[PDB]
């Protein structure tokens, strides 16, 4: 859909009022299936590795997050539709400039293509950005065509701060999700019993990301 109206009349007010925004049927079935084939080809060819954490201590990463991921820039051969997805997410964000809270969004991560391979794998309750690393908006696209969450699980449960109800997000095919990445939205991926795929980008706030880079570059 035209980016300007979707951004200004739905995404912006949803985010500022609730800190979570779902856009169903984002790209349509044909593009959504082409993305799924590209993700399945990354899986089949051994590209995924264990998902990792910002800080590692004594624990195995797999006691925290059970997924396997790869990072995609969007220009790689065989990832062209993932690149269209990323460009589409970026177009919405550019149309939101200066209207998502007080953030100034200038950049983002590469895309994290992630798979929970069934077997009860999930992600314990966490905050995406608890300590000021620059991430202000988490953007996730789901591509699971026949997902029945009532049997296969895999629900993303968010616990938005200040609300009388939690937000249950089934990982529905062609669903796009935005949420604030900071401590306002602790969330968990409940155990998945079938192969579950999602693609995430995180958008950076310029000033916070600059402070986080300064911290990293000074040790």
């Amino acid at each position: 859909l035209p980016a300007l109206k979707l951004a200004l009349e739905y995404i912006v007010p949803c985010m500022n009022k609730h800190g979570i925004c779902v856009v169903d049927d984002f790209l349509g079935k044909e593009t959504g299936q082409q993305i799924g084939d590209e993700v399945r080809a990354l899986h089949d060819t051994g590209k995924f590795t264990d998902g990792q954490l910002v800080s590692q201590k004594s624990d195995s990463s797999k006691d925290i997050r059970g997924d396997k991921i790869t990072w995609i820039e969007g220009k790689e051969p065989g990832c062209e539709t993932i690149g269209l997805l990323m460009s589409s997410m970026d177009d919405l964000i550019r149309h939101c400039n200066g209207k998502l809270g007080s953030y100034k969004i200038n950049g983002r991560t590469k895309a994290m293509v992630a798979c929970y391979p069934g077997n009860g794998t999930g992600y314990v309750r966490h905050v995406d950005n608890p300590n000021g690393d620059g991430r202000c908006v988490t953007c996730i696209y789901y591509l699971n065509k026949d997902w029945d969450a009532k049997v296969s699980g895999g629900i993303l449960r968010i616990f938005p701060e200040g609300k009388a109800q939690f937000a249950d997000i089934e990982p529905k095919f062609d669903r796009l999700l935005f949420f604030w990445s900071d401590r306002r939205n602790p969330h968990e991926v409940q155990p998945a019993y079938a192969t579950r795929y999602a693609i995430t980008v995180w958008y950076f706030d310029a000033d916070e990301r600059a402070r986080a880079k300064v911290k990293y570059l000074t040790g």
Partner: peptide
């Protein structure tokens, strides 16, 4: 509990995309 021990990793230098 340090919540960074639960937070998903991102590269901290060299890999940001400019919009």
């Amino acid at each position: 509990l340090d919540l960074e021990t639960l937070a998903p990793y991102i590269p901290m230098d060299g890999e940001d995309f400019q919009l």
